[PDB]
Amino acid sequence: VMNRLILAMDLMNRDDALRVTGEVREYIDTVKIGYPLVLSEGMDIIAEFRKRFGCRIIADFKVADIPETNEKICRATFKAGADAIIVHGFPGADSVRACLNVAEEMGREVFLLTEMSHPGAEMFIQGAADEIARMGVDLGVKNYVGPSTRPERLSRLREIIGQDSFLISPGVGAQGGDPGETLRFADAIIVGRSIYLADNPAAAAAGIIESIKDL
């Protein structure tokens, strides 16, 4: 991704989302759009963004249903123009395989979320994360998501998935993660609030890139 930086566009109204994304477009090539924006403005916002900014769109829907419903969610999401979708691994292998089958049919990609970045992830997800990552490898998953807030866990995840897999990581900025440290293990960092709630989003994005290039 351009500059190894992915914008998590979680503003909830179209006008603000369009303004901020346009202000930082020169510093990224990939926008992560999730339910806060889609449930507020509609799935058509994905194609509008993709077209208007000529960026790749990752739908961060953290898919976590049974196989049959996961297939339907992935189909609707790719039909809407998304390039990739983020799926939870904790529901198990059949749920993840359902997403991979649709991505294969539609020429898109699946990112497997292993361990989450917030405090509560320590309760149940962390203990299963190494196994979820190994399950991903066994299924042929090549794209993964891991926590910026726990670089030692990000390192262990990178260890399991190997150097050829692509790893992106949220939790930078607002949640406490560091761009530089996270990029020791992840290929790209996801940043939301530190950029979109900033008084000057372009300056915030630029400042992060400056740290990155220095690496």
Added chain:
Amino acid sequence: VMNRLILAMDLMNRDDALRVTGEVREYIDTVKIGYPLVLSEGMDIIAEFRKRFGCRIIADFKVADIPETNEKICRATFKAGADAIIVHGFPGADSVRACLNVAEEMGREVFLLTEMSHPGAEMFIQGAADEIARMGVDLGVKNYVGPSTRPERLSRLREIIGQDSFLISPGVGAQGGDPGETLRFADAIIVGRSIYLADNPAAAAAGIIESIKDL
């Protein structure tokens, strides 16, 4: 819930969804709407259904994000008219509390999904499910979702949450679960494909209710 039966309306186009829900409305008072329909037709479909059928709407979004995003998802979902939202417990207590705080602010309800009904749930979720249920009790959750496909697990979940909590259960019909056995522990059963893919959805719903009333 009328007849202890909740329709899982997962068709993906408005016309078919409206037709089937109208055909079975005399047998239910609650419709569960999820992402297959919402991502295909828009969040406005919730208010349309609520008005048209005068039914309660449970948004089955299996929310599974960090606290901050979960709040935004719940706010957008209740703004759209949903009476309740289903939330995953696996992500931890802070993620669940974020949903409860928004439900409290907006006068709505949160249903906590403990163990899922599909085969893959055995990999990671099942082993944490009793603890997720206890966490729910500790947080003051009063509405839960458990698996029709494993009545012995449904019994154990009922044991943890007590008789006063409300428990609904998916996996009846297509996934192999039985209405009668599931209702030994759950207050209501969720049924999707067995009704909406039937040649006569009203007859399918009626048949289920007849086996229920005989309890």
